[PDB]
A paper describes a structure:
Given the auxotrophic nature of pneumococci for certain amino acids, the Ami ABC transporter system, orchestrating oligopeptide uptake, becomes indispensable in host compartments lacking amino acids. The system comprises five exposed Oligopeptide Binding Proteins (OBPs) and four proteins building the ABC transporter channel. Crucially, SBPs determine the specificity of their respective transport systems, thereby governing the range of molecules capable of entering the cell. The five lipoproteins exhibit pairwise sequence identity of ~52–60% and share a very similar overall folding.
The crystal structure of AliB (residues 28–652) was solved at 1.65 Å resolution, revealing a closed conformation despite the absence of pre-incubation with any peptide. During the modeling and refinement process, additional electron density at the AliB substrate-binding site became evident, likely originating from Escherichia coli peptides bound during the purification process. Thus, we modeled E. coli peptides (VMVKGPGPGREST and PIVGGHEGAGV) previously reported to bind AliB. Although the electron density map clearly outlined the backbone of a nonapeptide, the side-chain density exhibited ambiguity in places, suggesting the binding of a heterogeneous population of peptides. Given that the observed peptide lengths did not align with the reported E. coli peptides, an identification effort was undertaken through mass spectrometry (see below). (A) Cartoon representation of AliB structure (colored green) in complex with an unknown oligopeptide(s) from E. coli modeled as poly-Ala (depicted as yellow capped sticks). The three-dimensional structures of AmiA and AliB revealed the capture of oligopeptides during their expression and purification from E. coli. Surprisingly, our analysis identified a total of 356 distinct peptides bound to the AmiA protein and 393 peptides bound to AliB. AmiA predominantly recognized peptides consisting of 10–11 residues, while AliB favored 11–12 residues.
Author numbering: 32 to 652
Amino acid sequence: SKTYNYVYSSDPSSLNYLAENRAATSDIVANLVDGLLENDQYGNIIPSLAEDWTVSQDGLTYTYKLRKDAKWFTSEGEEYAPVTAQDFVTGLQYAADKKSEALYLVQDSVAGLDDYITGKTSDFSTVGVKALDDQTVQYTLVKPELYWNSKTLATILFPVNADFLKSKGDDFGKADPSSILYNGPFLMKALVSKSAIEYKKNPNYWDAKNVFVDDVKLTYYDGSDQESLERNFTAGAYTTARLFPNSSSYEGIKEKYKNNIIYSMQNSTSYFFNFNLDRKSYNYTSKTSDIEKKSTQEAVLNKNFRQAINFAFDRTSYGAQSEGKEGATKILRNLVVPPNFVSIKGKDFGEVVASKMVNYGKEWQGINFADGQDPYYNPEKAKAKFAEAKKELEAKGVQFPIHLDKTVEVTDKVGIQGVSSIKQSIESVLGSDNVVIDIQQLTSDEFDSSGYFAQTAAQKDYDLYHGGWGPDYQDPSTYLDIFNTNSGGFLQNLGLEPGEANDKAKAVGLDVYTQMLEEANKEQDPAKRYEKYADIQAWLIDSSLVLPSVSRGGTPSLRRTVPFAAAYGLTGTKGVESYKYLKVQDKIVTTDEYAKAREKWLKEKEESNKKAQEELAKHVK
């Protein structure tokens, strides 16, 4: 038997792929449930449960033909029932009925779905998903979406068996392998909080031939023993290992593995810092007075203040805490939309955003948004912006310094160094008589419930947050919509609730931002549409409501995985998240072997993408 062994860091709150928008859930379910389409090794969208599909000439009707040999299985591997088109009707009705946190992916796209979710109608037969027969599912959209098929790689568009769902009721989708049915490459054999996630290859999966490992075992990793990754790799227990050049052990590791260290490419997941614009919870704070809390509440609404923090935040120093001195810039990401995410007549998105910055003030003159460098850090600009913020805030009675709470997990030693670097950088540039970053070290449970797994904006217990977005579909709106005041998926992390559009959101212009998103979304020509989203991304950078930080990837590893065997996707949950396609080998890959494979993959990706674009036209009516 061939096994992949490594670690995981995030336990899921549930397995409810229809109701969750957290990667903690979809990273797991990517291995357990398939949707209509998936990815190949090159990022092409290829058949999954749907063996064929058509789109109408007006772009509003998508029809999918499901393969007859796809079945649902229990967690023990027993066949439950064939997959049918009705399962996609069931899945969408359930996502709507449960008010899924990912409803923004479909609520404004599928005909009638907004009316049903919001109570304008009560009958799901008016919603644009239909099972025409057992093998044929048909979606009806409100407007054309060239990116619609990419959306089927998001879990809210995955199927569910209605009888199983009914039998389970509120038990459906709990963090228990028996809470869902399986139609994907693996069965979940173990899901143990703070201990293990274990997958077993499903021998009767419709595409079992493309699953090259029989078992996947992930041991819980809390960040307290970073040397354990290479230690267990070298002992033969892990298949891969992420290296930490700051560790005392790195000198010896690099001498042993001089020809084996492999750096991954930066990918489309973007991280950024944001502020809590309407903080309600103060369990984790170093502030002791209402004047301090009100002073911070006022400061985070002040644009000059946010820009001063932006220009005082040394991203190189931050990156160096995990990547070491020489690799410090390899992870840096300077927009929310990756600069190469789309192109506009051959110009990259980030270049167009840079072009738009000329209208947002001298403080952005000459900015370059390329990955892998820090265009923000600028102490003299930061100090000048802060002086302006301080005059504005003092006129309101604000007391200085402004204390900003940032949380970190007590066991997460690299994360503690990261946040310590941001404290040092900001306080060094602006002065601790002006800003203090108060680091709150929390237990796992406290870190989870005040942050990523908080269920309301009111439970967010911090002034600064560091989270990120993985794109759900191939359009800049997947990133830029997450701050809109009507339905933004990231709004709670800013302390705001979708719908409200309250005084604080208006104070920082997020209502204007939301209106801009609405206008840009109406544009159907891709070049024009992308140009409008570039202006929207420029507005957001200028607003400094986000402080772009890092991406995933760009990091060193040792590997016994076969280079570029796995699936890859720019968006969705069927790429690197999936252990389908992945292969393991005995030999530790060399840097030179990886480089040769990378150049081969880069060349083949362009050829394959061109073929894929050709194949697309055969599907119109």
